[PDB]
Paper text:
In the UV-[name]-NCPCPD structure, the F334, Q335, and H336 residues of [name] bound to the two orphan bases opposite the lesion. The [name] G154, A155, G156, I200, N201, and W203 residues directly contacted the [name] moiety of the nucleosomal DNA. Especially, the [name] I200 and N201 residues recognized the two methyl groups of the [name]. In addition, the [name] R332, Y356, I394, R370, and Y413 residues interacted with the backbone phosphates of the undamaged strand within the [name] site.
In mammalian global genomic nucleotide excision repair, UV-[name] plays a central role in recognizing DNA lesions, such as 6-4 photoproducts and cyclobutane pyrimidine dimers, within chromatin. Therefore, UV-[name] (DDB1-[name]/XPE heterodimer complex) is thought to be responsible for recognizing [name] in the genome, and then handover the lesion to XPC. Previous X-ray crystallographic analyses revealed the structures of UV-[name]-damaged DNA complexes, in which [name] binds to UV lesions using its positively charged surface.
Numbering used by the authors:
A (entry chain D), B (entry chain H): 30 to 126
C (entry chain L): 67 to 427
D (entry chain F): 22 to 103
E (entry chain B): 18 to 103
F (entry chain E), G (entry chain A): 36 to 136
H (entry chain C), I (entry chain G): 10 to 126
The structure:
Amino acid sequence: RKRSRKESYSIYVYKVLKQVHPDTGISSKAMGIMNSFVNDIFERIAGEASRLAHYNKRSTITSREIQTAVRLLLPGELAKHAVSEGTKAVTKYTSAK
Amino acid sequence: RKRSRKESYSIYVYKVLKQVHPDTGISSKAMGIMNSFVNDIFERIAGEASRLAHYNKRSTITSREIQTAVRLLLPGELAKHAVSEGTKAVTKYTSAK
Amino acid sequence: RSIVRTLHQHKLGRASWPSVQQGLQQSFLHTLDSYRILQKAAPFDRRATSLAWHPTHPSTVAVGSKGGDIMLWNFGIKDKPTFIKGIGAGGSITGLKFNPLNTNQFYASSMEGTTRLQDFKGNILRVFASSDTINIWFCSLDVSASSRMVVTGDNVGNVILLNMDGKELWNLRMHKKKVTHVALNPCCDWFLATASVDQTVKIWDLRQVRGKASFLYSLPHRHPVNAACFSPDGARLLTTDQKSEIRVYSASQWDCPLGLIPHPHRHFQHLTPIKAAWHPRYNLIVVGRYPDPNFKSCTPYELRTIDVFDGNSGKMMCQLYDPESSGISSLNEFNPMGDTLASAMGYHILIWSQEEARTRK
Amino acid sequence: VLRDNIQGITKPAIRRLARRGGVKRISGLIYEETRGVLKVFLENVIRDAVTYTEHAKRKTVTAMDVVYALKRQGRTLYGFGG
Amino acid sequence: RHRKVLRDNIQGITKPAIRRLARRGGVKRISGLIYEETRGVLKVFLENVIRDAVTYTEHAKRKTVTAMDVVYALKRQGRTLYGFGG
Amino acid sequence: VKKPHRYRPGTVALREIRRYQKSTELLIRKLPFQRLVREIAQDFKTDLRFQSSAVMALQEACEAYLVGLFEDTNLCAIHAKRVTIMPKDIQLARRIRGERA
Amino acid sequence: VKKPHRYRPGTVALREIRRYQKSTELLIRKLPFQRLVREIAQDFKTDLRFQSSAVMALQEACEAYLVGLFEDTNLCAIHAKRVTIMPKDIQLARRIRGERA
Amino acid sequence: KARAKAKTRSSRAGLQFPVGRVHRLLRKGNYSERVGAGAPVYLAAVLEYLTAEILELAGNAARDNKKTRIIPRHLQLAIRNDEELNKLLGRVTIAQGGVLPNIQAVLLPKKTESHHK
Amino acid sequence: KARAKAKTRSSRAGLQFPVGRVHRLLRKGNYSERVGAGAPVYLAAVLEYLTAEILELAGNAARDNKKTRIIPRHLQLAIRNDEELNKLLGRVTIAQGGVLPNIQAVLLPKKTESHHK
DNA sequence: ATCAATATCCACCTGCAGATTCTACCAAAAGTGTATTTGGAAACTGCTCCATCAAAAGGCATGTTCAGCTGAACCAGCTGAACATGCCTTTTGATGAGCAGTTTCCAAATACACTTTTGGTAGAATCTGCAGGTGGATATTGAT
DNA sequence: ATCAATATCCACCTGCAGATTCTACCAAAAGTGTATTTGGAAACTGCTCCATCAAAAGGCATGTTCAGCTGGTTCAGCTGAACATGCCTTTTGATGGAGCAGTTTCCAAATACACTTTTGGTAGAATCTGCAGGTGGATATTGAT
């Protein structure tokens, strides 16, 4: 009867997996690893963005701050593709306000 | 009406130095080092307390949270002495009310 | 290519004066590469700051030192060049110009804040301006004999205009910052162009502008401007900026520039500001080079050389470089005859003349 | 001799862990040293986990507690929440 | 001139300087090839720290690399530097 | 057949290396580790319980750290023109990393 | 007596070790390090300016890092029954610590 | 009353990861007093791309082993074979992952083995 | 009506460090929505104790070298000669800090001179 | 083993370049008075963990044994150490302009209150990879 | 008169633990509004950063000698890896109890917010004085006899 509602990123990870490899499944334990990975990167990027905000005496976390956080955490060519994807996402979102 | 004000921990560090060694002086670079040390340890303990408040779904930072943060961060016997000093300080403060 | 065929072709009158001038200029460039030899040089205490050519005498050159020393150097005489010692602290002669009437005097603008008329023998005749106050000095200076006017600028942006006998009616501020150069046109005698650190050049007509900084035009510039010099014919204004750009403006539509000539002459506290100069009897522009790691240089050799361009086409035509003088040639002023070039390197003054003509018996 | 529960980490198990790590020949004295190293590491992790659980007014060392304890040492662990 | 003192670069760190650093660390005898590897490692470390500092300065829209930028860049990697601000 | 098939020293070791590198099941036994963890806990505080997941996490972290230390120890051992891991190698590996504690 | 006083190999090495561990003066000269830092800054952005304090911080950090690395390297060299540090010692130290090499 | 048919901010941005959820987690978490509209979209896109990369490499690893389900072992191979990801997750231990095959050359024996009798 | 004389929170707790300043820095900095009354005093006390320990060791080191003033070197020796402080600040560099004079034994000249041919 | 060149330890003696020590003040702290939350007591459920029983059965403690490894002892050959000396290269003091560092505003942005509805999930029915079990089929490493 | 223990490795087949998909519910997310607030653009300004040419003072790049470390080559001896055996500790199941980790609800200390009064750091001058740099000796290091 009584039970809380756990919030996870399982369904969205499954959707992405279906996108990249339609005929493939993921175990529950792999799903746990993916959930931990998503949460960890969220915390890393958010923390670096928050520091970047406070360091410049700013109080709002804008897209520029997350851009710099991504530039700072990720290595090599991973940063380029990720920044491009984020830029496309924000451009699409704002173009259809 | 320009008036710069750079807040620092120099005066308090000097007071403590005289308390623990009256016939001693501190160089400006030494005072900068002590300033950095104080700020670093403050950030460490405060951030650990913030993290603890989040895990337990607690919306406030109380003396218990700082105590647990100190226990986590500081090593060895420096933890026992620091916690004893904190408990003595808090009991002295409350007894004054 | 048709080195000698063109002059005879002219002589019949088939060629107009401009084509003859073009040919003579080409001959000048062709001979310029034999000038490479440095005939003479001379030391004195500190960095050289000012260079002035004797209007008539073709061997007398005047150079000032950052410490207030003035040297009259007539080449080939070995007369122990006249030297006037200075204070040495802030006596820098920011600008030197002979008195057109009596060549034995000169108009010298100094960091003291005193643009003065002084005889080369040493005695000071008369001081034209003195703003006192220490953090107010004079930087610019120009004299027009035709109208007998003397113009001098200040460090703040207020220029002064004085007669050769005094009675200034001027001192109206025209720039928000230091006024670097003021040039009185040779052809006309009433309109003046001034370059400042405000990053703007303003052209005035002293006979008609008196209404609270009423300027004929404003010439915006991306960076500070060091010099704004007119062609001897007075039909072109050559403007030198501080990072890398040279602009030429014609009397037709003063505002727009004829050509942008990229050239590295970056600024330095301890370097005499680099100034491009006009060739008295041709359409050539002479200016030194100051290499930059960030500047775009296609050639594999990045050397400190005195470049020569052409006023119209805006392309390089010749370069001067002789090792053993690899310093930075801040100033470069041609001899009025156009035969000798005098350069102001740091602590050394260079003359790029050549030997004489055929020998007698 | 008292077992002390540290001998519960048997010698063959140490051989297996060493084999997976790329070694080929084990000197005799490696066993005591590895037992000591493991004891120190476990002491650190359990101390941090116990501090966390005590602060929460609990009596069960949750999985999240050990995961958080490993975060501090820079040994982040994936698979048990986060 | 094309001075380029042996590389115009990391090769400007004279051999006695690497010897002095090694001696401060307790090194007694040094092999001949150690110098080039030391220069390489220094170059990599400097590249990383400078990249972090330059990102910081670019974010604030500044034309200077402030000291606090280098301090925070080092703190990112875990080499906090005491004595320049915090 | 005077003697049976006797693999030379090393070959079985290499086979075991392959077998345990191709696998992922835990190498430490469950009950001994549980008892050891509970001993350490009772040392730090009395009457403490453990979720099975917590003990699993401890096992995973300990095994991962130990295998990493063994990789570094082997790297050090080869450096010394040897193929044997000795305590001095573990000491050096822990010292360089900064794990003196 | 005609033979000139010649210090035997090593007696200067230890003296330099003591001298440079008892002091704190920066060992890398200002100008070469400044030029190096500025050159590496070109690749990431053009027209950058460095505060003197920023370059001093970079020098301090680089010298400290190199001193630490040389300490760990010398420790590796001893473990190999040697007194001379060679490049493979640097490579092993960096591998163990966690850097690329 | 208009009540335009609600479209998720994820759909507006063409993303699979939620955009509202990241905005909520940023608001609650004391990362900063204010969170902008563009921040959640950018962060969701970044997370989606990283997940896509790791999952694609893991799936490629699975196909090489004739396995159609991604188990924890595969993610370890994906992360520890690609240098950039290894840098990103160099200080993370994957549950039930194992280690990459690696045997130092000094250990491998002499190669003399061929029919000679 | 009374407005008792203002008494500093530092005096109440008998600490030389500013309790009010730590409160202000905790509020501005977003460590948590609310800051309890007793947290700042505890944190100030901890900072004071650690500062006192470091300065005491630094002064002892200074007296060792026959100097009345604490320069950055003397802090380095204090931090590096005490185990607990060395561990708390094991990943930190001190401007003009220097290093301990430790020298490995094998490098020292071999005084074990025995019978030789 | 005397001795004979250095280095380093001392030990006075200035003077000046930073440190202490006076100010004024204003921004931040402290003192009342309400509002408004936390979080902690107190009472539940029922979920997970402690044990504790079987029975294996798979692992390990346990002795031979001998094959390869690890450490000595010299040994030749070379390569870093040490000094000697001119020659760079670094270091540094001469009296402009850029830009970091603060004020001050809005227009744009984000936040804050209710409302509608909808993807989010509690758990339940299905499918179904593949773990595990036979069987060959080679394959490697070690014995004439 | 190089094949054999053990392995690896593939091919195939079957059932179920355990993923996938599918009902339903409802907690957050949008949507529509009204209210704060505050990021970046003018504006300024005062510290300080860019980098040349003399002049000079020190380090150092370049060549000898040559002491000693250092890879290499033999050699014992030791020792641990491999294998055979029989006990025995550890896995799978259990079956409950039950301790207490979560889940509701209530309200009273606790802290926020806000103003208004107060005085404690802090930015400048003043001046006070460790000690860095000299000057000399006295002693210990070190070294080839």
